[PDB]
């Protein structure tokens, strides 16, 4: 059946039993660079399991009242394993993430998550006049939550009706977009490949894309069901190449 | 090249449920009308022309609106090289993360001859200079600066009266596509210009009077037309909802999501 | 570039050019056509076709319906003189220049072809009569009796169960095409209606019988030189 | 009509005769193939 | 292409009645002067050129005419498209209820320098912005508001003293013909706009001018010129005989059938 | 012989002793609308006899000072049969209409009936700053006659000289036209076909065209005739097919 | 609601109250329709001026798995009112919704235009129909299961959808340089 | 999987995920009537959409109490579309009825539905001396409900037990059957063909049949659980074919 | 000459070589042929 689901990307592996197919990122599979597509010169650091498996990264508790989260990858990744050590100590780096986001909720759950990989989401500050720092955005350890209304500060817009890109949310199924649907879907999987203008570009200074998940039906239980419905994102880089061996970057 | 032609259909009762399908797998049901319904064999002679992106972005857009005057700094226009000034192109654009088009601009420069106590002076033709300087480049700082000796940098050189001046654009990205959304910051320390600001620096475009001085105050208005072309589009994004409010970063007051309607059932007319 | 000399037409805003102009829209998916009936590729197709012509234009009944209508009787007054008789020209003849052929005449300044005027009795059909219907070619002063209309070409009509004869003016021009507004040296003829016999009527039917004139054009008609038509006058915007 | 009058291929008409499209890229992005005449689960 | 030549005739004495044919059939008839006359054999070298929709409506008329001027919304000419504006192209798309005809705009514009107390100061040559905004999109409300920012709506940007603009415009009607008698509602109900006012809605032409501003008041008038090439003409109609009165409805005041004579057998000279 | 004819469309028939030759509208006859020209992709419902059929409509007395009467097709077939109930449970319809004006007059009648259908016969309003109502112009029950002279008002200009489309009506032949002459003809035919630029079209918002009768020479019939001449459209519908069934429109 | 996340929630329940009643109605035509104009498709729609094509919505039932009910959305063509009673949209196009594993059923508008293509403009020449979404079966749910389910609508544009002739997007109005 | 069905009926559609194999009435699949078998010489009006579609009637509440429901057809299908009108607008008609009853319950619902399709359903009277009117067993707008037990008066006998035809309830499963049990099923679909003697005959003095929806475990629900239960009948003609148009009957 | 230089359809030269003419949809729309040289009944 397409329920069921293994991914055995690396060490890690993930097994589901409810799980719908998983979106290809744009439809393409992700592989390694190849030399007519290649910008640089340095011989590819191609760790096939070291950095080609599931991280599973910090599970955040879905409540009724969450607008969202989003997770910054790969800067989300820093401190996961040999990949975030590849990241530290190269200067280029690529990657095709398949991530795989686990909501197990029971059959008496109602919620519905747009775990969607937007490439490039740009996120809009909540002042617009200024910036926010590096640390609103950015993924390292918790997910940063859209909040359900507009905010201020040197922060980012986390108006969740806006998805912090001044975009519609209900359009970021323009991007590979998975729904984990309570009804139908515990975990959503997307493989989505390398996605940048540039062959390689480094893994800090830019966010490949973001995972924004998005609650579009809150999570509704009656009294009595698990409270604490956890939204685990479990991303496994594929064919990840690294070029420029450097000076680790913290 | 036509679009798919509704293929004709009849009553079923079968296990296929063409309309049931299920968005948590994230794929856009492939249905037909003859799927769900039952419909007639519609040759459609209707075809996505206009909705490629190539002629989608073939209507050419103004991007850059300023005055330089002819008789300091207000004497010719600098423009930081980006669609994202005026709006009108600018969410065409930020509809794909990464375009890969040669640009197509088409400067339209109009004299205003700003009103003063006395304009009773006839200035010959205006000739203008839509001087390119690459990133990194020398930037003038004065109408007459030597930078303006364009020995390397590209120049029109237009004439007022004459013909629209356009001089298509290669693509001149560093990378393989133009970021039009970049969540990234300048620096590797994560510190530094957000947006596409960072990837985006496709130089400066200086535009100044050749001649060099005018009786009289002489505001001309230059109107720079981006005409995108061999557009390769590469990933899909919805326009902004909100309007744009800096033109360096995507920042954005909350917007609705769409027009509000007096409720869920309200269905004009 | 290449050397290109500019003709003294240059840069002219010609009303009837055949210049190829760049596209509004490139690329713009028109609606698919479909075949609507009645596909008009040219109008001298309306010219062709009938048109119920206002030959008793007489003033007041223009308003009216009685305009199309030419009044025959069973009465001997007025035998001797026409049912009705106006110019040929299509072009300034008052009866045929808001006709199909007319209107479509006005929007040219040449005309050339055949007209040909459909007249149907539209009377008792017990209501039998012979009408001499005659086209007397320009040169000569308009018929004032009928043996001058017989000396031009002319057709009897008997009434009858057809109820329609054609009074087919064969082009008698000096040259090939005549011009639509009045000009002598291309003036047309007269067309002019007269009683070759009686419109006898049975007592139980009226004696005030109704004809209807319908000018057409035949295969040969064509028109050579377009204007603005005299008739769509717009005294300001709308 | 299609002729290049200057060498540089940037400096040519856009290209608004090229139709192709494949919405299978957002449309139909999953690994599975999936069927509309098949259940999806 | 020539029309048919007159074939010879003679005397005839036959039961064929050429002549005598039926109104009452509704077909009009096919008679030839041969037929009812004796006529020599002509060869009609005439032919049915200039005659043809095609050719009749290649006569470039007018169909708006504006003054939008330079230093609210008198700064730009603001047309709903249709040709009804002018009655002289009007009453020849009229000849047709539907014409598929995809139609070449070439706009005339004349700036006037209108009669002040100071007109002493030369406005270099006005470029002008003629922009086409489709049905239901963004509809500027001032000479420099962001619509007039064309990412998707074609704009000639004419500079005066050069030709005049000509951009040759597609069949866009929704509908398979441009439907210029419409006896139709707007709304299913049968209540809101008849005519042709409601199927064809072919969008709004702002003009205005591309120079910021003037010295002095110049209003410039746009005389908006329809060709229609490719016409394909479907059901022909009579001309108008009375004057148009709205330029929104076929509304007309009563009018005479013809000029009227003095009498039914009063034949002029 | 051509005076005679029969047409048989749908359960009801016409048989006619004295008519001409019927004018097929514009030389096309009507069809179904065929795939490659249509725009519509519902199922088209195509009753062959149920709508297609004639219908008899209200019988007007040609008066001596009659100066003419016009029916809205299709908006005048409403409440006659299933083609009425068909046009209000269907967005949108396609149907080929052979109009039958039937005038039986004795020998002794003198008058002439141009049966012209007009398309999209645009009337003029009796005052031209304002619009008529759709009362005005709607022929539902019956036929909405032309004034000998001018009328003014908040109706529809209905001066027959004009036509009420300020045409020449003398002109009005360059339309499919049919010659009702009592002295040969006692009934006219015309088989118009589907007009419209759209290829199918909401049958109350817009009339496919106007059946317009208008009596160029007036009845005229001495003392003893019978006075009550009946002017009677029997029109068919023929190949009548329409698309998105929905709620009956009233 | 547009400010926060329920403007895309279409709010179900398992209660009689209401039953006859559409859980929603609004206008087919995605370029003017305040439901359809902000999306992908309608997005895409009012950077046009005509449009052509089917739209489908993907209606996601977003509740309980044990939440089982049946739906009637209806698109109903223009020419007659609103649909009022789940009579009248039934008598125009409609799909019955059995929710189940598949959990998404798509509403296919069958492009019933008397045009070639619609204007995305609003004109009620060129207006589109309704689509209504009503109960053909209550929402019925375990007592263990929220009521209050919710469900998302998905338009999206099938392989006949087309746009003809360009214009620039109302949406996107700029007060002044940025 | 046999669970899940679609039935594309004309314009309006049917979607189930649990719904056992439709009953085929009898096993002959609805079909027009051949000219073999045909005994009217009209032509036969056939709309293949515009009538032969599904028409959601009136959700009735599947109460605890509730003994059963009968719905009368084709009478029940009365001021339903075009095919209530061209039953009005017509003498005979034919009709092959798909009707789907959907019964949308929980997991946690005990119930099971007779639904069943019995050809000439001849109802009794409440007292057998006297007959009872039209409008107590014509189903025009509501389901008329079966008692639990006897009911008296000018009307009919609604008794479950005997199914108001005199016959064992539990052996109406003789007649085209399927069951809605809540357990397995909630949508239940009887394609039952055109039943009756004549090849064709009038839609409003004789019902081609009745579907029977009896409750044989009345609807039984913990507290907490949805206790407005709807059993909505979309019923679906097939093939529907109609001679002798007529005016319309009231 | 007759080259046309825009790649759309609709930017070309008007169609004034073409004289296609049918006025039998007008002069001749009887269904039954009505030929001249016979009564018309
Ligand atoms: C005057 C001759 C030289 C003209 C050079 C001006 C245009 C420079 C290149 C522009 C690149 C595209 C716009 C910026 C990148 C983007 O955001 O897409
Ligand atoms: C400036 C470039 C774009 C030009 C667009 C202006 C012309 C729009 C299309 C006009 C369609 C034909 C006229 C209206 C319909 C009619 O009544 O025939």
Same mark, same amino acid.
């Given at each position: ?139 390292? $350890? ?80 009656? $009294? ?27 | ?269 | ?238 | ?17 090229? +139709? ?12 599975? +193939?999936?069927?509309?005449? +098949?259940?999806? +689960?």
């Amino acid at each position: 059946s397409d329920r069921v689901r293994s991914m055995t990307l690396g060490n890690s592996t993930i097994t589901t039993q409810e799980s719908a197919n998983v979106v290809v990122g744009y439809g393409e599979w992700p592989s390694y660079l190849s030399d007519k597509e290649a910008t640089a010169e340095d011989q590819p650091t191609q760790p096939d399991v070291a950095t080609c498996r599931f991280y599973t990264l910090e599970s955040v508790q879905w409540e009724k009242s969450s607008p969202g989260w989003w997770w910054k990858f790969p800067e989300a990744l820093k401190n996961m394993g040999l990949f975030g050590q590849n990241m530290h100590y190269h200067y280029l780096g690529r990657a095709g993430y398949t991530i795989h986001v686990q909501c197990n909720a029971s059959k008496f759950h109602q919620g519905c998550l747009l775990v969607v990989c937007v490439p490039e989401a740009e996120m809009g500050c909540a002042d617009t006049s200024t910036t926010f720092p590096a640390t609103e955005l950015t993924t390292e $350890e918790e997910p940063h939550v859209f909040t359900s209304d507009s905010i201020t500060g040197k922060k980012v817009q986390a108006a969740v009706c806006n998805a912090g890109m001044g975009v519609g949310v209900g359009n970021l199924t323009i991007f590979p977009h998975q729904w984990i649907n309570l009804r139908t879907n515990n975990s959503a999987t997307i493989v989505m490949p390398y996605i940048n203008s540039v062959p390689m570009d480094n893994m800090f200074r830019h966010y490949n894309f973001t995972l924004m998940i998005i609650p579009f039906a809150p999570l509704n239980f009656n $009294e009595g069901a698990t409270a604490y419905v956890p939204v685990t994102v479990t991303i496994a880089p594929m064919y990840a190449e690294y070029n420029g061996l450097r000076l680790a970057s913290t | 090249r036509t679009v798919a032609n509704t293929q004709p259909s009849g009553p079923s009762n079968s296990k296929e449920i063409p309309a049931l399908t299920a968005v948590e797998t994230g794929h856009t049901s492939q249905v037909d009308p003859s799927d769900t319904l039952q419909t007639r064999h519609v040759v459609n002679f209707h075809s996505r022309s206009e909705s490629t992106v190539e002629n989608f972005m073939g209507r050419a857009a103004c991007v850059f609106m300023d005055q330089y005057k002819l008789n300091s700094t207000d004497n010719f226009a600098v423009w930081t090289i980006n669609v994202r000034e005026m709006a009108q192109l600018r969410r065409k654009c930020e509809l794909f993360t990464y375009m890969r088009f040669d640009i197509e601009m088409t400067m339209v420069i109009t004299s205003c001859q700003d009103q003063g106590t006395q304009l009773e002076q006839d200035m010959p033709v205006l000739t203008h200079q839509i001087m390119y300087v690459p990133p990194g480049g020398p930037i003038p700082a004065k109408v007459d600066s030597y930078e303006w000796q364009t020995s390397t940098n590209p120049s029109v050189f237009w004439t007022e009266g004459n013909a629209p001046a356009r001089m298509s654009i290669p693509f001149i990205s560093v990378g393989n596509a133009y970021s039009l959304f970049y969540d990234g910051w300048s620096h590797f320390t994560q510190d530094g210009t957000y947006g596409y600001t960072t990837l985006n620096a496709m130089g400066k475009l200086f535009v100044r009077h050749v001649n060099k001085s005018s009786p009289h105050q002489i505001t001309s208005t230059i109107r720079v037309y981006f005409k995108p072309k061999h557009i390769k589009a590469w990933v899909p994004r919805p326009p902004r909802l909100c309007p744009y409010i800096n033109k360096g970063d995507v920042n954005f007051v909350v917007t609705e999501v769409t027009d509000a309607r007096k409720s869920i059932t309200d269905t004009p007319h | 570039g290449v050397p290109v000399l500019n003709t003294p037409g240059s840069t002219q805003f010609l009303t009837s050019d055949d210049f190829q102009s760049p596209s509004a829209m490139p690329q713009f998916d028109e609606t698919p056509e479909m075949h609507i009936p009645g596909e008009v590729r040219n109008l001298m197709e309306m010219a062709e076709v009938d048109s119920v012509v206002p030959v008793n234009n007489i003033t007041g009944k223009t308003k009216s319906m009685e305009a199309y209508q030419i009044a025959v009787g069973t009465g001997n007054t007025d035998k001797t003189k026409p049912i009705f008789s106006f110019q040929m020209d299509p072009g300034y003849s008052s009866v045929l220049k808001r006709t199909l052929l007319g209107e479509m005449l006005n929007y040219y300044a040449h005309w050339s072809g055949s007209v040909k005027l459909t007249f149907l009795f539209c009377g008792s059909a017990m209501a039998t009569g012979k009408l001499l219907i005659s086209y007397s070619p320009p040169g000569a002063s308009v018929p004032s009796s009928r043996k001058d209309a017989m000396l031009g070409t002319h057709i009897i009509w008997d009434i009858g169960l057809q109820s329609s004869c054609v009074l087919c003016v064969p082009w008698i021009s000096q040259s090939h095409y005549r011009m639509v507004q009045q000009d002598p040296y291309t003036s047309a003829g007269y067309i002019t209606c007269w009683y070759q016999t009686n419109i006898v009527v049975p007592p139980g039917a009226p004696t005030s019988c109704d004809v209807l004139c319908f000018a057409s054009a035949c295969n040969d008609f064509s028109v050579r030189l377009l204007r603005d038509t005299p008739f769509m006058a717009q005294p300001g915007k709308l | 009509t299609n002729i290049n009058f200057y060498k540089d291929a940037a400096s040519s008409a856009s290209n608004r005769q090229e +139709l192709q499209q494949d919405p299978g890229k957002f449309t139909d992005p999953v690994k599975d +193939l999936m069927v509309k005449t +098949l259940p999806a +689960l």
